[model samples]
Target: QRLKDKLAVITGGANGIGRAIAERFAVEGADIAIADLVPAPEAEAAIRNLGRRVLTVKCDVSQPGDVEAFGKQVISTFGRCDILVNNAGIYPLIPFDELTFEQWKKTFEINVDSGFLMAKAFVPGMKRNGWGRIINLTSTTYWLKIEAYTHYISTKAANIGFTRALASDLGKDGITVNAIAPSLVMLQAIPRLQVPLDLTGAAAFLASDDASFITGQTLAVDGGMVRH
Candidate 1:
């Protein structure tokens, strides 16, 4: 029960890595609130069955208003927020020459702007409590560029910048901001993708007390996709 009595809010938590994070947190005794475009009945029911409080909110992370409202609603229900998983994002690949402004804007809006809004919205509660964890979702594509991933890579780079800048501003307040750059950590590969990251228990460490001193860093989970 490392996170016993703590409350966490996770976006894009209906599936993929985001969903995995929600389950992990619930198992550790943390109440969770999840937001995504689709309804997450299975996830909600599963968390509830685990004996942890769960709230599901329908939200489009690209819409700042929706993110703000979701954050407010979570506070109203839980009284305070101890953790925030900024995991909502989109990755629609299009060649750099053919990329439309609308597509680029949408990617930036969700991957970057949504994080700004969520942090601004919930950081007050964390500051008041004198402790908080801000886990952001970046991607390893910035290091391993995939074909026609310009829009996605730009946003991924922005995610890292956001984590670094925000961490500097929030560190003194006892809040640590970090980013997890996962590369294809999914099975049954989505089309045009090959291989996923080799990650087991790595995320648990980032979200746990072990990473208290680690901030403003992007930890990659890609399977040697980008060798240093």
Candidate 2:
């Protein structure tokens, strides 16, 4: 197992893409710390079935207090975190005219600020360990021109920016930071409709030693559908 001895903290891991990544990492031998408001008994059971330890916390990642408490819980339960997946992000379809200031800020809060807070909590441990991986889940929407997603797209762009800027600073410390942009599959794509599992392999790669030299880059997993 490539991830054996590692601990991965995933935000928004109760279901969907986050849960998929958590389960995949567990199979790869990494212990799991899941942060989400919803109960994640299935994810917990999946990881345990793989014989990996798992911790689930009722955490709303956008909240600083909640993120901090979750981080402490992970450290105490797993000793330290080796990989962190900032997979908790929401993309609501509201046009600019309809989108309120509150909606825009909440988008950034969940999609962007949560990553910052998570890094704030965990980057220190990664720096001390001299080996770590931080993977952010962005979206192919960055290159799209959907009307009702101005705010959503903006936050995704920030996700990429954050990955690059943070990766630059942490490279010297042997901590690689990267972003993964998943494709739009529900409608249509060359590879067909993409399930949450479609992106798991890429997530695993970023969290593995094989990607040790790769950082500050965004890997698009959108079945090559960039038509926006």
Candidate 3:
């Protein structure tokens, strides 16, 4: 019950790494609000099993209006938001030569712009409370420089940059901003790629008071993917 009674807002939390984090946080006693374009019935049911409050909102996180509305809904439902996870992102495999300008911009829109929008919408409430946590998801691909994902890699690197700079700005307000750069996660959608790292535990640690003094750091959760 490390996060007992805390209200957490998670984007793209309907499945995958986001779903894992949501379920783990629920076990720690945090209420959850999930914002995603896809429905999250499975995630909702899982969280409910833990006896924690859950809200699922169908939202396009890439859009400013949608994120703004979703933020308002979370506040209206939970009274205050204590933790925010900007986990909504897209990683499409396309060679740079074939990737269109539209496609590249779309990647940044979801991965980068959405993070900026979410922070703008929710951080003020955290400042008001004088305590909050902002966790962004980056990727080990950024360091690996993996092929066929130029746009995706760029956005992930930008996320790390955002985390470091934002942490500096918000430290005075008692709001810790950080990021997790994970190795290729093992999700049902991708069965052939066998990466063993799971993000649930790392995310929960950052969200809890245990990380109160930690800020603006991009902790790599990939198992030896990037030797620090």
- CA lDDT, every prediction? 0.82, 0.91, 0.88
Give the residue spans of candidate 2 off by over 4 A: 185-191
The candidate maximizing lDDT is 2
Error of 1 at 89 (Å): 0.9
Ranking by lDDT: 2, 3, 1
Alpha-carbon lDDT of model 3: 0.88
Who wins the TM-score comparison? 2
Residue clash pairs of candidate 2: 183-222
lDDT accuracy of residue 197 in candidate 1: 21
| TM-score of candidate 1 to 2 decimals | 0.91
lDDT of 1 by residue, 1-228 (tens): 677888988888898777788878888889999989999988898899999999999998778789889878998999888988888888876888999998888788888888888888899999999888998888877877469988888888988999999999988988888888777433323333533223315555666788889888888765445543
Error of 3 at 68 (Å): 1.0
Q: Estimate each model's TM-score.
A: 0.91, 0.96, 0.93
Candidate achieving higher lDDT, 1 or 2: 2
Question: Sort by TM-score, best first: what order?
Answer: 2, 3, 1
